[PDB]
Amino acid sequence: SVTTIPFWHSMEGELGKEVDSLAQRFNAENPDYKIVPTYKGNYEQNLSAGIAAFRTGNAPAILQVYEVGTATMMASKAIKPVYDVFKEAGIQFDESQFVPTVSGYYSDSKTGHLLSQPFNSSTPVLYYNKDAFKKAGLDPEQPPKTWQDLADYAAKLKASGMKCGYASGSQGSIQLENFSAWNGLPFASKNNGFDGTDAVLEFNKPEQVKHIAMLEEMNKKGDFSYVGRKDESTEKFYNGDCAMTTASSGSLANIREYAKFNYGVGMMPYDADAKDAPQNAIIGGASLWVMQGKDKETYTGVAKFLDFLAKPENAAEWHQKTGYLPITKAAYDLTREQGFYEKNPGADTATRQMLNKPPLPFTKGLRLGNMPQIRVIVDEELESVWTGKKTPQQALDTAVERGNQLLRRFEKSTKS
């Protein structure tokens, strides 16, 4: 037989074509199953569409869902954990192959087993202009390792004639979520939400407040430019406006294509005063969920497809062609062995950040309900610091209080 396996996703353009190519290869290699990818819209649209279809008995078998939708999928009663899909298919499933801070975001807090499989994963890194560094008398092979050094570098790069020292983008919440994990701090109680829906937000502590205050001082001096339009920080970097920026690891391919200068990619700076720093970064992007209600041939095909995506050759290909992270340690090692990092300098930096230290219980990821709305609140409150409306402490306190109201609404929504 050939079992058709619908896979609904949000990958447009060339990324969608790569999804199609992988499905076509899987289908050729596994002739009893036919993965059928369909683009269903953006992340919010695909999540809504998949759940609504599940309610009427017409869900796809596989649904790509962004990282901030994880709590929603867990509360939906609509998913079969990936670990269970493999077990019920009778297919061996080695969860240790994944980079632990990539699969960790999507794993069960009690058992460690995978609930959904990381698909397109990213993390923020530091892009920097090596030619600008040289002109400022900095070592182009030594990007700043701490925020304190970054502030000094930004001042020297501005003074040497760069229009902009350091730019950071609209993604303020993602930067503060990563700041907390990378500095060894919880963003929320209950191990970053993993241990329950009674978690509360905790990112208004001294290190976060100090970090935002530092950025605000840099802002006041003209050394930090907050540029809040989507991807504006990346464009200001690759256009030569900004000497340094923190942006998604997935932006490297665009940077390599448009930058008219020698760029480098460093790990995120950390707070020099934070004892546990640098710790580990956390992922963004999306994962693949498997829907309930399907037959055994469907789940066998799903398991085989998820396995295929994680095989070293296909996981390496994915990382090399799309710019997303290698989801497995074997895919990273293979990519290196193939010389790809000599042709694409800096494309290994993000993985090295993911493996910097083994994660703490509260640095595996962030698991909060209503997280899309919490991110907007955090983004807004940080924007109020840059405008001079609020102090760092006032903004983070406000974001914690407003965000906690969202967490409580989500918690009550799960109660019968």
Curated annotation (Swiss-Prot):
The keyword Endoplasmic reticulum does not apply. The keyword Chaperone applies. Induction: Induced by phosphate starvation, via PhoB. Also induced by carbon starvation, via the cAMP receptor protein (CRP). PROSITE patterns: SBP_BACTERIAL_1 (PS01037). It holds the Pfam family SBP_bac_8. Its main location: periplasm. GO terms for cellular component: glycerol-3-phosphate-transporting ATPase complex; membrane; outer membrane-bounded periplasmic space. Keywords: Chaperone, Periplasm, Signal, Transport. Sn-glycerol 3-phosphate binds at residues 43, 67, 122, 248, 285, 324, 375. Disruption phenotype: Mutant lacking this gene fails to grow on both glycerol-3-phosphate and glycerol-2-phosphate. GO terms for biological process: glycerol-3-phosphate transmembrane transport; glycerophosphodiester transmembrane transport. NCBIfam families: PRK10974.1. Belongs to the bacterial solute-binding protein 1 family. Part of the ABC transporter complex UgpBAEC involved in sn-glycerol-3-phosphate (G3P) import. Can also transport glycerophosphoryl diesters, which are hydrolyzed to G3P and alcohol during transport. The G3P moiety can be detected in the cytoplasm whereas the corresponding alcohol is usually found in the culture medium. Binds G3P and glycerophosphocholine, but not glycerol-2-phosphate. This is sn-glycerol-3-phosphate-binding periplasmic protein UgpB. It comes from Escherichia coli (strain K12). The gene is ugpB.
